[PDB]
Write a protein that binds this ligand. Sequence first.
Ligand SMILES: C[C@@H](CC1CCCCC1)NCc1ccccc1O
Ligand SMILES: [Mg+2]
Lengths: 317, 793, 221, 55
Amino acid sequence: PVQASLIMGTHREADLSLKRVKTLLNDKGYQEVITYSFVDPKVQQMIHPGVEALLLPSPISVEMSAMRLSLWTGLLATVVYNQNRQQNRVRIFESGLRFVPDTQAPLGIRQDLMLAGVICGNRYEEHWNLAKETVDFYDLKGDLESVLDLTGKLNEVEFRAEANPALHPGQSAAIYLKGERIGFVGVVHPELERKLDLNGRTLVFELEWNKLADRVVPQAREISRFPANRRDIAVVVAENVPAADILSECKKVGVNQVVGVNLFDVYRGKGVAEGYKSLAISLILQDTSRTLEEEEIAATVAKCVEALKERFQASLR
Amino acid sequence: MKFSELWLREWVNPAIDSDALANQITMAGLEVDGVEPVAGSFHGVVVGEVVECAQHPNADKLRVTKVNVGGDRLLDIVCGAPNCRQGLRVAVATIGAVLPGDFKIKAAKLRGEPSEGMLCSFSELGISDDHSGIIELPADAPIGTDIREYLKLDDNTIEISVTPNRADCLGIIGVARDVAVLNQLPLVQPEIVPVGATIDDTLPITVEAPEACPRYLGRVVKGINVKAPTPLWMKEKLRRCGIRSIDAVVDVTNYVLLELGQPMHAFDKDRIEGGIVVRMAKEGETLVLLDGTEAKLNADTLVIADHNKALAMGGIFGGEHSGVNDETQNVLLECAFFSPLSITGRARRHGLHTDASHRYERGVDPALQHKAMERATRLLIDICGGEAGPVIDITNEATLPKRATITLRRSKLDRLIGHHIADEQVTDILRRLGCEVTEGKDEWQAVAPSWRFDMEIEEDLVEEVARVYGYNNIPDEPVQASLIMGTHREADLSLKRVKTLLNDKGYQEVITYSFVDPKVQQMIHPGVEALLLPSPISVEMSAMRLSLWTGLLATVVYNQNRQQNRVRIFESGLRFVPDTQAPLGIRQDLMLAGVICGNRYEEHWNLAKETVDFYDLKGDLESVLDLTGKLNEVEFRAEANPALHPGQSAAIYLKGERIGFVGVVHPELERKLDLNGRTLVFELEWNKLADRVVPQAREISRFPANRRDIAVVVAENVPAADILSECKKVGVNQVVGVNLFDVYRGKGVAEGYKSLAISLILQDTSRTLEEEEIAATVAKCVEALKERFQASL
Amino acid sequence: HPVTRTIDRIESFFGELGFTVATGPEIEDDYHNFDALNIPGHHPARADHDTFWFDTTRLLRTQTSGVQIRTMKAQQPPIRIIAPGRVYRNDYDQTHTPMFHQMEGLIVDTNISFTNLKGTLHDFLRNFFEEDLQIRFRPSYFPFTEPSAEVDVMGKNGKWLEVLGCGMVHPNVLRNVGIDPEVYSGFAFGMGMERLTMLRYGVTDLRSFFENDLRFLKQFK
Amino acid sequence: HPVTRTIDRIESFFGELGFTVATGPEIEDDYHNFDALNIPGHHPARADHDTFWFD
Ligand SMILES: C[C@@H](CC1CCCCC1)NCc1ccccc1O
Ligand SMILES: [Mg+2]
């Protein structure tokens, strides 16, 4: 056996293990997949039209002659592959490099490690007590929020509606962390879904791994031995106003006392004018040194309502 | 161990401040626990004399006083202390002085008479709790001098933890000797000249247990004044070491204990019938200790006795009769060396713990008795008067312990430490510690000094060399070793992998105490006797847990009492079940348990509020069991459990072995525990699922498969899993999948009967199937449900 | 649980050095908890040890030494194990709970020295607190090691803070498990997980670990 | 993925011996894939590997 020193090396608790994220995805019903780094440029052109990919002179075949600009060509080819074998429900993910031509990158090609995945079919397998419903946008986002919650920075994640040629423009989001774009998520565009011959609605995502490979190290905070108070507010805004921004404003305006902000209902129909919506939000208030009385509770709740008035032109009901 | 820094500095005074000296003592191995000031913070208090003292003309119990403080003229002071009288040397807080508590001394009148300061008690100066009267200073106290300088109140008491190896560090001399070695300084020792005897008085002393007492020193002092006051300098050194002053004879013996580490005792010579007999006690001897209580002694306990009765416990505690009292005029001073093994454990047996027993059971210097006897003799007669007889020396050279001769090898020193310390430094360190060292070829032969009881083998000298050289002067070096792989087993399932899945299903890990309240555990596991602690921290933590449910259910109640109804937690840990076939009569199995309650999810804009039920927890349990790859061989059988709902509880079986339980907490148990609502618990024997299946690639059919649904109506009490298991077992290699997707009972099915909608997937690895063979197989499956169960529809 | 976070980090630190995790029962006999560690029946650190006894032989362990003694008896060197587990003492204050967690390490090889003890634990402390922090080794005493030491970390308030204990395995301990101290040597160490967790994440009350308030535990996800 | 299980097992075997995992890009240059490995341009390994070149 080798006779050498025993030195530990340098660890960093703030690192987020990719294997830990894979374990979470497995525990959410996802199978790991490994696809070829070179794909058919015909298919990739249907997904990323007009984007010139680094091509292989003298490839193994024409269908494996283009370095993948994302992981979606290989992923979407895998679900079609399985759907041709009588398997409609496909929930898979893959980690691997993408190759985007970039003159400012070494060797003229930028090589980023990505985490991507796709889901389709029913939410669950056939079950005597689980309803047969096709998977939707908020199913995939729920799994993505589970992944991003491992960083401890979920309070700083944003899903902004953003156009991507491969995605349905009304159900697609660019993902942001602390203002930094980290990925994209949405249902595949129906025309792109009609192409490739996909069985129904399919949901894809892709995350730049190194953007979220860090996590917050916990610092203990004191717990109040005094009881907390809940106050709900009804907030009516225009439809196009994102609900997460109202929540974000509430948390930012009430920092000292407001220890919790949660949306529990969103209503748009009879009772609210067309083109508008009402957001039911619970505000939990607590203090570490005393119990709160109605005067201070009402003052802070009013402080949050006025901030929603200033920023969103919201109204209380 | 408490001691005065200034007293220690009388023996060794390194040119460094209190913080550094205390750090040095800590770095010697005597960790300082605290450093406290000797007196309160004040200024403007000086030595004075009561020149004139008279009755206060307007207050019955006050006095008016002229005080000389060495100023231009005498001061008018009013004093109400009972001991105030003319000629007294006192501590005078003059005008402008500030006393502890920001108590400024101003000139004022008290009951009509002027007072230009006040006479102070020890309590007012923050020196002690003495407020019975004003401080009385020695008659030669220097008038006008700051009492902080005269009483040395700029001093600290240093408290150190002394581990049992450093038996030599239970006195001023021993702590100072170690500090001197660390500073490469000599030790300054008091001149202790022997007291010459002026009378011939003795008494017979015979030792029947010379193994327990290799040396006993008796000495008589005739005609002492037991009522003589202890001088202030001795009261202060006693107090700054944590010992209050009692009477003059006990005070001198406590002083030599503090100074030299030698315990000593004083008998009333007139209450000694015959002589002194240092012997073992008889089995069942009765002795009334000095605290008034009676002790029933065993034959392994050493006693100091006379020719009739036992007088004291040797080196532990004194008796009530033979001690010094108010009428005592003649004393017999004891100063002995007792064998540590003969004293150890006896004090704890009778709930005793004294300064003497603590030192004797760790080891007092067997070459110290004569010097300590002469020290006490002079101090006693200089305080209480009297005449000293000759020293009665009963020493047994055969049982007297011998100084150890130890060989320190260069090879062992360099190997254990890993750092070469020069030869001259090694021999210098050992000699300053008191060893007789002769150098050899790559070796040292050392004779340990008489006071060290932790120098028997070579490694002891390695530590002495290392600790004096300096631990932090030794460099760092990585371990050299072989890079040999451990033995891995891919079939191992990790507990950390299971904890991760539970986290990814919404479970928070908790850790609870292993001893619980038997009042509440007897509610969860009634009739099951648990292992109890005879001496618990409390009765609510006196029963070793038979499961993890007592800790988990106390945790949800705790959180629910703090406005949190929804709690989903788990825990891994041992249970303790009495088992005569187990090691130590108690079987300790590693368990994995958890509990959920409240709504399935937190409040959500797209999820509706629904309370958790049995199939929610069972789903999480199937996710855990699926990690083993043996979920096909798991059975949930309804089974009785006193803590659980009889209609919603199941025993978990794996390959015909019960591995755990799961179910809704019984509603009456829910009531008694003050649970907010429906609560579901589980528990698994961990080692039964710490093993998993290693995958083995099987061929996949390239030919399509076919699905046929059937609706079977059976009895309401027939478990659906047995029906599914029958379709999978009775079916040949054609049917590859059996799944239940509906369970109906109501308008259409008879009462007490249910319809189970089952999907059967059929496929072959070599060919494709057609309707003939397909329908013949679902017909074969449905006929298997005819005799064992009921027909279809 | 935050204590689990700590135990997992330390297991990964020493796992890269070839240290195997070993566990054992929490109820032990006086042999594996005292006698095998060179602590005779008359030894002070035994009766005056705040120990929970059931009878004269069975006790709630004060250290995870039982698994370390059994491992040494069952194999010759090299030995490289760490032993985490719950231990028990009678005290109960703001900084003391009757139950707590201890991580104990042991390595036994041919030329294990005190210099290796310093370097290994200095590496460990630098990784655990993730900084080039001030530490010191300080003479101490344990019946099962010689030389013995405690290591302190410079506290944020200017005072040294005792973090762990260590030493070179006593030759009596090696002898009664069948290991020749003239051929083999080794060092061992022990540390409390609650203490290190408090210093790492800023927890100020040790009792919070066992109250299991979901608001305290949720901070450590 | 089955090969991921294999990689993770091998990483844990050598990790106990102090072997640190290191990763890098998959498109490499002439120097790091051949030249620094004692494989000059006139060495048959630049063809015995049957390399996918871009230029
Ligand atoms: C109680 C011991 C038990 C081991 C010691 C020697 C070999 C047997 C097991 N725990 C490790 C340890 C080491 C040094 C100081 C404190 C400490 O806690
Ligand atoms: Mg020693």
